[PDB]
C-alpha cells in the first residue's frame, strides 16, 4: 500500500496545487511572484501504510529526489511553452541517473485557460510519444482529471 510519487515542473505551473487536490481534495487560488516562490513535501501516513508525495522546482537535490524516487510527474503550464521546455533537462536528468521501465507522466496542467493556450496538445503528444511516457491535461482549479492522473500513476506496478 506504500505509494511514493515525484512531481517536477517550473515555478507556478501547479505541482502542489495538483497534489494538494489529490490528497485533501481542496483548492484555493493564490498568486505570489517566483522571487518569493517552489518546493513542497506532503506525506500523510494512511492507516494501512503510507502515501508520500513531493514537489520540486544552489543545491542539486533534484539528483537525490530522482535517485531515491521511483515514479515521476512532469508538469507544464498550457499557457507557457517555456515551462514545457524546462522539463526536457529534467527528463534527461532522470534518464542519466536511472534507467525505460520507469513510470513517467507528462501533465498539461491549467488546461481550463484555453484562451491562453500556448501549447497545443498535438506538440505535447508527439513529445510523449518520443519519450514513451503517458500524457494527459489536468486542471487543479476545476478538478479536471486530477484523480484520473494519480490513479494512472498508482496502477503502474
Ligand atoms: N487557473 C488555474 N490556476 C492554477 C491551476 N493550477 C494551479 N494554479 C495556480 O498556480 C498557482 C501556483 O501554483 P503552485 O502549485 O504553487 O506552483 P508550483 O508549486 O511551483 O508547482 C496557484 O496559486 C494556483 O492558483 C489551474 O488548473 N488553473
UniProtKB/Swiss-Prot annotation:
One of its GO terms (biological process) is signal transduction. Its main location: membrane. GO terms for cellular component: plasma membrane. Displays low GTPase activity and exists predominantly in the GTP-bound form. Signal peptide: none annotated. Belongs to the small GTPase superfamily. Di-Ras family. The chain holds residues 6 to 169 of 199 of the full protein. The modification Phosphoserine is found at residues 30, 114. GTP binds at residues 9-16, 28-34, 109-112, 140-141. Ubiquitinated by the ECS(ASB11) complex via 'Lys-11'-linked ubiquitin chains, leading to its degradation by the proteasome. It is found in: Cell membrane. The gene is DIRAS2. A motif (Effector region) lies at residues 31-38. GO terms for molecular function: GDP binding; GTP binding; GTPase activity. It is a lipid-anchor. This is GTP-binding protein Di-Ras2. Keywords: Cell membrane, GTP-binding, Hydrolase, Lipoprotein, Membrane, Methylation, Nucleotide-binding, Phosphoprotein, Prenylation, Ubl conjugation. It catalyses: GTP + H2O = GDP + phosphate + H(+). Highly expressed in brain.
